Amino acid sequence: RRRTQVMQRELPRTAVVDIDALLRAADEIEDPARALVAREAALLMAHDAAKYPLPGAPPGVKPVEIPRFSDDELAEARLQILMEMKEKPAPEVVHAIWNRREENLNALRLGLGYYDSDSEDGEDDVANIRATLEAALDRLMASAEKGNKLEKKLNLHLGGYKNRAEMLRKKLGEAHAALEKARNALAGFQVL
Amino acid sequence: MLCALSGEIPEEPVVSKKTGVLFEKRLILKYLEEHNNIEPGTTEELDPETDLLPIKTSRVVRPRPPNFTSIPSLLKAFQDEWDALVLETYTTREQLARVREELATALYQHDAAVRVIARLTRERDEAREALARLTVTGA
Amino acid sequence: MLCALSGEIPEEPVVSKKTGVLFEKRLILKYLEEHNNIEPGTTEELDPETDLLPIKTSRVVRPRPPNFTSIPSLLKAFQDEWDALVLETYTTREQL
Amino acid sequence: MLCALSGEIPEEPVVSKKTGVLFEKRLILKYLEEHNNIEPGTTEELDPETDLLPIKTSRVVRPRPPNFTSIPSLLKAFQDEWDALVLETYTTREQLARVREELATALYQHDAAVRVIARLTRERDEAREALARLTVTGAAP
Amino acid sequence: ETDLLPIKTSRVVRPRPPNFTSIPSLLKAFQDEWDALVLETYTTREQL
Amino acid sequence: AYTAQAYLSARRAHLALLDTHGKNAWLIGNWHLEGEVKAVEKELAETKREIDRVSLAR
């Protein structure tokens, strides 16, 4: 419970999190409350990586100590935030906003996580698209190699069964032709 | 296919006119002689000479083997793959819509919490300034 | 048993009450519509609403080949099957 | 109308008796099998034998384009449609992953804001207690 | 008021027009073409 | 590249399902094909027997 909530929740954000660079970016924030929130989020991400290392992340991440806070203080903060919360937008409004985002920006552009709203430069978008294409090509090559190995193993396992099925089908076709010829011969023999 | 009682491909299959369940001729005959002409799993009585109809397979058409490379089999496999992909896309879209609604609610709550945090920081700074002034004046 | 109209195992088999010939339900309905409700290969009229008995059994599952595991491979196989069916129909017409 | 699960007009659609949402019979049956009798878009359980009712109407005639009069053109059109559907599914999966990552970042920021708000409330309470103690100890003129 | 039930619409998916490019429509057309070819081949086989 | 990766993932899933159920699928298909071939051979044998009986009577 002392660890980060995102660590115990689903959909992990990043296996590798840099506390120092995120804290330096938090110090560059002009708004003081936003800077404090970003620094605390960096500390929470570092504690989540240290306490709950995701698959592929390096181990031995150093944890960060934090002061103890009562649940009553968190409940009071949540009540204050709910009192300060305005009217929630309807689901239709959020759906229309998402549809406008998917109509103005491209669906492939919206799917890519490097397409930010403030990234109007074509060079940065082109570099991000090139990096994403290189990563996708590497992943596709690895998947193709794994699928080729699996297909080779399956073919080596089931080639005899396939050959037996083909031979049985050919024998069945020859038997059907012979049966038709025999039926014709029987009809002719009866007439004769 | 398969037989209901024997569990294998019936050499001389027959179909009950009441239930439509295929069965082998000899096994169903012995069961009807042993179960007083009553079908298995049903309390209805089936006539061994009337309710049973033989199944005939004319060899006029070319016998297509039931392989996965068959054209109707390929069509059925394509339909099944399309249905599975549609179900997966529907589940993924439902999960994405739920995640987007949760992210929008989290963004609104984060904006409210940032406003509350700024107000609390201003109040704490004012209280610290008042405490410092009281400590300086309180000689 | 296999469908007499399709040449393979019917997904929804139906049998005539008098002829007792297994066929696909859609194929039997199309043949009845295209021949004024007449059993194919016979001179006796067939009623699809009363004389057709559906077959309630399990579905036969074809073994998927290792090569036929991709959408483009499936499309190529479907094109080859359609071309083979067209060639077989043309050869059957010429032989007739 | 179009089916709710697929977005296209089903050939043999059925309607739920609770919400009145049109769907395909096979797709709804597969979804109920996969989700253990859960209706799409809600959490209520609708029985396909009872809550799902078929609609008896005339078949809508789809206008076949003149391009779809040959085997190769129809095959190319079907291949293009399948490729478009596969690309749409991959884009939907990538967008869902990006939305999940963004929601995780937003939840981390919200938890950080809650912790900072609790810390600021504790600091403000301590400062207010110190100010009250100084005012009680001090002699106000 | 009781026997008539209204029909609701969900906008989870985009509106696809009922054209000839639909996957299910293409599958139905291919099945109909296969059935017609099978009927023609069966008539030709009976004649042969 | 995304379409190719989706196709590769679908092929990998199909290969995994094939490795899971290949023996059952091949056995069921072989049993059905053998039953159909046996039925066709039985029909041909019955026709040949009837033809032989007619030939003997003639």
Numbering used by the authors:
A (entry chain L): 529 to 720
B (entry chain q): 1 to 139
C (entry chain r): 1 to 96
D (entry chain t): 1 to 141
E (entry chain s): 49 to 96
F (entry chain K): 117 to 174
From the paper:
The spliceosome, a multi-megadalton ribonucleoprotein (RNP) complex, catalyzes nuclear pre-mRNA splicing, where introns are removed and exons are ligated together. Highly dynamic RNA–RNA and RNP networks form the active site of the spliceosome through a series of compositional and conformational rearrangements driven by RNA helicases, providing the necessary flexibility and accuracy of the splicing process. To ensure fidelity, the spliceosome needs to recognize and discard suboptimal pre-mRNA substrates while it assembles, is activated and eventually catalyzes the pre-mRNA splicing. Here, we provide high-resolution cryo-EM structures of such so far undetected spliceosomal intermediates that contain suboptimal splicing substrates, isolated via the RNA helicase DHX15 from the thermophilic eukaryote Chaetomium thermophilum (C. thermophilum or ct).
In addition to the ctILS state, cryo-EM revealed two novel spliceosome states, refined to a molecular resolution of 2.9 Å and 3.5 Å, respectively. The two complexes contain the snRNAs U2, U5 and U6 and a fully assembled catalytic U2/U6 RNA active site, which is docked into the central cavity of the closed PRP8 structure and stabilized by NTC and NTR proteins, as well as IBC and IBC related proteins. The absence of U2 SF3 A and SF3 B proteins, the Retention and Splicing (RES) protein complex and Bact proteins RNF113A and CWC27, indicate that the spliceosomes have passed the Bact state and have been catalytically activated by the combined action of PRP2 and AQR helicases. As C complex proteins such as YJU2 or CWC25 or C* specific proteins are largely absent (except for SDE2, see below), and the pre-mRNA contains an intact 5′ss and has thus not yet undergone first step catalytic cleavage, we conclude that the isolated spliceosomes have been intercepted/stalled at a catalytically activated B* assembly stage. In addition to a pre-mRNA containing a 5′ss bulge, we found disassembly factors TFIP11 and GCFC2 in both quality control complexes, and DHX15 as well as DHX15 docking protein SDE2 in the ctB*Q2 structure. Since the DHX15–TFIP11–GCFC2 complex is known to associate with ILS spliceosomes primed for disassembly, ctB*Q2 might represent an intermediate nearing disassembly, while ctB*Q1 could represent its precursor. In the ctB*Q2 complex, we could unambiguously assign both DHX35 and DHX15 helicases, with DHX35 at atomic resolution. Within the ctB*Q2 complex, DHX15 occupies a binding site similar to that in the ctILS complex, interacting with SYF2 and SDE2, which is normally recruited to the C complex after step I splicing reaction has occurred. DHX15 is fitted rigidly due to lower local resolution and adopts a similar conformation as observed in the ctILS complex. In the ctB*Q2 state, DHX15 is positioned in the vicinity of the U6 snRNA.
